[PDB]
Amino acid sequence: DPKYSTVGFNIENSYDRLMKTIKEHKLKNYIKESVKLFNKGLTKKSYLGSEFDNVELKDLANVLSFGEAKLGDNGQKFNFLFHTASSNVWVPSIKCTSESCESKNHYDSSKSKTYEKDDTPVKLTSKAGTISGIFSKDLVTIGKLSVPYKFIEMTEIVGFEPFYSESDVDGVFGLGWKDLSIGSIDPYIVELKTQNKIEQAVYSIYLPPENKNKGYLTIGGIEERFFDGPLNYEKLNHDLMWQVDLDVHFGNVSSKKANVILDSATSVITVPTEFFNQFVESASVFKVPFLSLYVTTCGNTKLPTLEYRSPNKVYTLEPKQYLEPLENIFSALCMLNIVPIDLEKNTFVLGDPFMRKYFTVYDYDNHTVGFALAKNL
Amino acid sequence: DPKYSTVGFNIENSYDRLMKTIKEHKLKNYIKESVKLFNKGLTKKSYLGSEFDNVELKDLANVLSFGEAKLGDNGQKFNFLFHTASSNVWVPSIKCTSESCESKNHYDSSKSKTYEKDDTPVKLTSKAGTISGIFSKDLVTIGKLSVPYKFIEMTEIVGFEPFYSESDVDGVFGLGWKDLSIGSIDPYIVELKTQNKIEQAVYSIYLPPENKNKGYLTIGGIEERFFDGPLNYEKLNHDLMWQVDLDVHFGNVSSKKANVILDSATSVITVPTEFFNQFVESASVFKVPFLSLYVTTCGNTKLPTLEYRSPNKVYTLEPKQYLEPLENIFSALCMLNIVPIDLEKNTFVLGDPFMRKYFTVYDYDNHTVGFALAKNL
């Protein structure tokens, strides 16, 4: 229905992936019998305490995808994944020599009335892989909104496997601030408003509480029907990141003036390792040996409400927003959707769990981020 | 049949105890699914490496018991357990006030024609518990052999529970050198020979390969029928211990001039902790989390032959003498009958596993210990 322009997207989540592995490696009974042991409790040994760096920040990325975006006059179709920290949109060239590219949808400048050359070259060089290509300008549509935007047409794609090959994803659409170019190419959402296609350079994410494979992106205004109560804005502590200054308390474990990043693409709440150990130690939480898995009774009376405090608002997360049931492994068993991981100093991220509770707003004009209590729809 | 005097005794072993616990705590499937995990092998984590001091030397004691020894003229019956390091025999007094004593057989000096007073008091003060009592002299019989021996009649017994209460054992019979008294009370076996009831102060242990609940003690001579090949003697490195000087090699892991103690009452081969870690590391051996249990495929091709070298003889143990099948938990699964434990510096013990292969001789006269290849009877 909405009066502002809204798209659905699909999510592959951490739970879906963990379920996959448990079936690959036949792990249900090992988890079942470990938990029983714990309940008995013949696991006095903690430590547990297992320094599993299995965690890098990319291990925790969900894939948020949609296939109703189109390029140029002819409307060439592409499956993007959203990335919340990047300003640019990225799409395989018809010219792409690599093998990764063979099974994917392609941009063909030749086939588009609206196409303009730019031809400025770009290389993105990374940990997981490397991408070469060139800027082109064409009609970028979603699907009520449309604008001539400068995007990247990728010619060499190496790495990112096996995900890229196994994924039906073509490229990346940018809901962020960082532009690779030095031509000050604005965000897609900035450009819509520059060209007057919307009225404000803003968007929201709405993650419905009851469907963890779905999300909704709304562009150009605040859709009042997704939330109850007031919207609170916090000011960014960074020019180029959806990042905010807050004091964080998990029970008596606390950290003041923490950098907290909003990324609905992350699958969990993250916390520095020290902080996590203070939290989990004697909180009745069980680290299953040889797995990146923390587990507890879903009704655990020791688990605190998590708090993210600003000078005028506190955002909270009860145990039911940070625990995922595992009813098909063990009755009343849940896992923790909290992972320990050290990034920059004193840096935390709010992923999927936080946004299932809070509807969120991402405001390029006013350099703010907005929080409100999601409805259940 | 034998020409020298021979008694059977029963053994409760480590395997019997471990089986008990697995049934108490319902652990079969946890062990099964852990091993599967290992086989997969999703247990890259070693360390494993779990410093379980669950091990003290007493955790590893088997109980070797028999009930055909008798005291005095009237032949008062008692269930002893053998202890290989103690010279004295120990038995509850009829006077014993403690509760431990209530269910046990009792020595009543009054009821014995042959009894002589000694009345010299003795206290044994220990880690697990404390024993007070007094020396008495009476006819100590087993059951072809008999001699007036001075023994201890215990009046206060505190501690040693819950084993003592749950055990049908009354007291302790000493196959060792250490006499608590200062009256130079010889070993029971010395005294037999002093009084000419035997011809040599010697005994053997024969542990049959195929019945791990049974052992045989022979007193006063060498029973030729228990073994094949020659007897080798090593000289004790200690006046009061069944202890011997040897170089020990387990594969490339080695230790020269080690103190190795012969104790068939110990349930395992022991090894210092450092030595054990060097041994087990990349030997394809799996420490089951939260259990004092090391586990491997019974056909493991990496396991070496264990070597105990003297200047003129080496005693060896193949993997089939140091591995116990667990066929009723997992097919072709075995456990290691080797435990890490640091005692004195460079000190090792040969328990049940070694003696299932080697028939052993314990020679008080010549201050030697004798080794030979056990028959299977």
Swiss-Prot record, chains A, B:
Which GO annotations describe the biological process of this protein? acquisition of nutrients from host; proteolysis
**How does changing the pH alter activity?**
Optimum pH is 5.7.
What GO molecular function terms would the record report?
aspartic-type endopeptidase activity
Domain of life according to the entry: Eukaryota
**What is the regulatory mechanism acting on its activity?**
Dimerization causes loss of catalytic activity. Inhibited by pepstatin A.
PTM = Proteolytically cleaved into the soluble active mature form by cysteine proteases in the digestive vacuole of trophozoites. Proteolysis requires an acidic environment. Transprocessing may serve as an alternate activation system.
Q: Which residues lie on this side of the membrane: Lumenal?
A: 3-377
Q: Which Gene Ontology CC terms are recorded?
A: food vacuole; membrane; vacuolar lumen
Under which name does UniProt file this protein?
Plasmepsin III
Species assigned in the record:
Plasmodium falciparum (isolate HB3)
- Which start and end residues of the full protein are shown? 77 to 451 of 451
